[PDB]
Every structure is written in C-alpha cells, then in structure tokens.
C-alpha cells in the first residue's frame, strides 16, 4: 500500500526466519514497467532508490570514505550507477569502480578486467556490486548456488571490508551464492532490498549493514535464498517511481564516523557495540592503492 511511496521494499524479518524449500520464482507483476521520469535510465533510477534506502540504515560515513563498485559498466559504455553513487556520497569520497568491459566513468579510478584480477592494498567502507551474467537466467536447468564472481566477492568482503563497513550485492533468482547469504550473518544486520522501479524482476540487493568480522548468527544460505524467493513469490510489489521525484534528502549524511586501527585482540564488546551502531570504522587510514593483474601472452 504505503510501499509505493518508499524507494523499495526490504525482506520482512519473519520471512528471514522461515525454512522454505527452493521454488521457481513466479512474479505476478512480471513484465510490468514503472514510468520513469522523462529521459531517466532504469539504472539511474535503480541506484537512486538503492541509495535512498541505504539512507535509512546505520551506515558508517567517515572522512575520506572509500567505496568500491563492481560491475559498473553498461552496454552503453558509460557508468550510470557510478554517477549516482558519486552524487550520493559526500564530496571527496574515494570511489573506485570496475567491470569486465571498457567504459567511461566518473569514478576516481576505474579497473577493467575480470573482478578476480582486482587487488587493493587497503580496506573499504562500502562495497557495491552490480555484477550479473544474464546467461544465468536459464530456467531449464536446476538452480544451484553459483560461484564465479561470487567467490571473489565473499573473499573480498572477508579480507578487504573494514569492520563497521557495509555492502550491497545484486542477486537474482538464479544469480546468487549460499556463502554470501551465510556472510550476511557477519554483519550487525542484513536484508534483501527490492527497488520499486524494478519490482517486476527477481533482482534484489543483498545488504549487509556494519561488518563485524565474525558470525553474529549462523545462516544456511541455501535455505535463506529459498526464503527470499518465497517472500518474492507471495508478496507482489507494485512498480513505482514515486520516490524518484523527491531528492531533497538524497545526499548521504557526512557523519564523520571515527576510524581507528585496532588489532584482533582488542575487539571487545564495547567496540563491537559501536561497530553495530554505525559509530566506528576499524581499518588503517593509509593511502588507497589498487591494481589489476594483466596476463602476458606473445601469440607470434
């Protein structure tokens, strides 16, 4: 009802607690489209609503924030999502994006290649991934947990996400990974968020809010994806672009969250409590250095 004026809909907590079996995703509103404002691209609208929803969570927002965005290129050769992220994030935020194919971007640095070729010295405060392979939408074969870039993403989160940081990772009915759901239980809170402009799609963003670096809760990822599909199957979401017309509160609030360097022995419950509330980031504050591996070949 009232949901049409929200940026989107998050998976209600009761659905997270079920133990459903995995079914085919059958969306009543499949094929509907929202009416986008004149001249606005689906991906600008989608990222705008994702950011509007992230504005309601307890994101850590330090000075000299570091954000990395995987899957940032479009088939148009540009980076609409990156442009929205840069609009959303405080001015000066270090934003790196990446994709398999060449594209022109507003990010501070762009790495081209398979995400597995990306290395960074430093840790990050926010990881956004729109990575997606449309060859997963094969409805004729069984729907199993996928590896590929999801294996990289899980490792990248565990090794390179600052304590207190957050993630938003695009999944769909067939593009999902059980360990990523399991890793959601290593955050103070988590959800699967569906944008109102793309509610006719099984797409969702898996959002982990304030990383703790160890399991707060044990999550079976095969069951949780079944729970997600169950929720989607039984709760039609009305397509809506309403939230796109009110941008006055859009910018991410610069909270000046504290950044500290600490050693695993010093993460006590007071610290874990501040992490859980979005009041602390734990990582070094050195310079940000990235690189992409290049395979060398002479074919002569």
């Amino acid at each position: 009802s009232s949901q049409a004026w929200q940026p989107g809909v998050a998976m209600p907590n009761l659905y997270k607690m079920q133990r459903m079996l995995l079914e085919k995703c059958d969306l009543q509103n499949y094929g509907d489209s929202a009416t986008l404002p004149k001249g606005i691209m689906m991906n600008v609208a989608k990222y705008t609503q994702l950011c509007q929803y992230l504005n309601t969570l307890t994101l850590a927002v330090p000075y000299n924030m570091r954000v990395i965005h995987f899957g940032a290129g479009s088939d148009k050769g540009v980076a609409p999502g990156t442009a929205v992220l840069r609009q959303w994030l405080p001015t000066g935020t270090l934003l790196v994006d990446s994709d398999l194919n060449d594209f022109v971007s507003d990010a501070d640095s762009t790495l081209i290649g398979d995400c597995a070729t990306v290395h960074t010295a430093n840790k990050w405060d926010l990881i956004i991934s729109d990575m997606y392979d449309p060859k997963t939408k094969n409805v004729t074969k069984e729907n199993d947990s996928k590896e590929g870039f999801f294996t990289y993403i899980c490792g990248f989160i565990q090794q390179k996400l600052a304590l207190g940081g957050s993630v938003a990772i695009k999944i769909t009915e067939h593009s999902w990974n059980a360990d990523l759901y399991k890793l959601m239980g290593h955050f103070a809170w988590w959800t699967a968020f569906v944008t109102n402009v793309n509610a006719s799609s099984s797409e969702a963003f898996l959002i982990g809010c304030n990383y703790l670096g160890k399991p707060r809760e044990q999550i079976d990822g095969y069951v949780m994806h079944a729970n997600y599909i169950f929720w989607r199957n039984t709760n039609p979401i009305q397509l809506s672009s309403y939230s796109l017309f009110d941008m006055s509160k859009f910018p991410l609030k610069l909270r000046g969250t504290a950044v500290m360097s600490l050693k695993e022995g010093q993460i006590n419950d007071m610290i874990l409590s501040l992490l859980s509330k979005g009041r602390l980031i734990i990582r070094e504050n050195n310079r940000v250095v990235i690189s992409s591996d290049v395979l060398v070949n002479n074919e002569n």
Partner: protein, 115 residues
C-alpha cells in the same frame, strides 16, 4: 604536426544532420540548485538538466586524448548542467560553449557579468 581534431569533426557531423551522441547519464535532482555550469554535485535549476560529467565529454566518450596538455578532464568526476532546451545533445553543448571564470555560469546561459 598532425593531430586528429575531434571537436571539429563532431561539429561538422552535427551540421550535416548527424544524430547527437546519446546515453549521456542524466541525474535525478531537485532542480532547485545554483545553476552553475560544472559542479561537484548536480546543481540544475528549473531550466536545466544535470548529467554525469564523463558521459558528456567528447574526449572521454570517443576514447581519445584530452586537448589539455596534462590530459586533464574538466568534466569527469563532476556534473554538468545543460539547458533543458539543449539537453538533446549535451556533448555538443559542452563542446561549443564556455564557462564564465568569474561566476561559474555558462556564457549566454546564466552569466550576467556583462550588464
């Protein structure tokens, strides 16, 4: 001595009836901003659209060197305000027009330092 003149090539392509470069990334915003030409965040006023800068830069979009000797881009990483009446061709607009160095508005599209 030789150097491709992309700016000139695009103007001639346009003059002979070519379709303007598309897929410039238009931003959602309030349209109650300062109206300055090139800004760190979207600033369209009621008569402008805001676009992601890199997608409106001829040199970025064509994958060629920037005319600045340092290869610096005025637009990448920023937002460019384009008059709504010219928003069918943001690359053409940024190419043909110039920003007032005093008030930051587009010359002839907001700048009034001449009255």
């Amino acid at each position: 001595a030789f150097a491709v003149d992309a700016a000139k090539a695009y103007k001639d392509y346009l003059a002979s009836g070519g379709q303007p470069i598309t897929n410039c990334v238009k931003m959602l915003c309030t349209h109650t901003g300062t109206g300055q030409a090139i800004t760190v965040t979207p600033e369209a006023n009621m008569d402008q659209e805001s676009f992601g800068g890199a997608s409106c830069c001829l040199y970025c979009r064509c994958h060629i060197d920037h005319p600045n000797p340092k290869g610096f881009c005025d637009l990448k990483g920023k937002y460019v305000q384009i008059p709504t009446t010219c928003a069918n061709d943001p690359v053409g607009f940024t190419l043909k027009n110039t920003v007032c160095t005093v008030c930051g508005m587009w010359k002839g599209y907001g700048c009034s330092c001449d009255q």
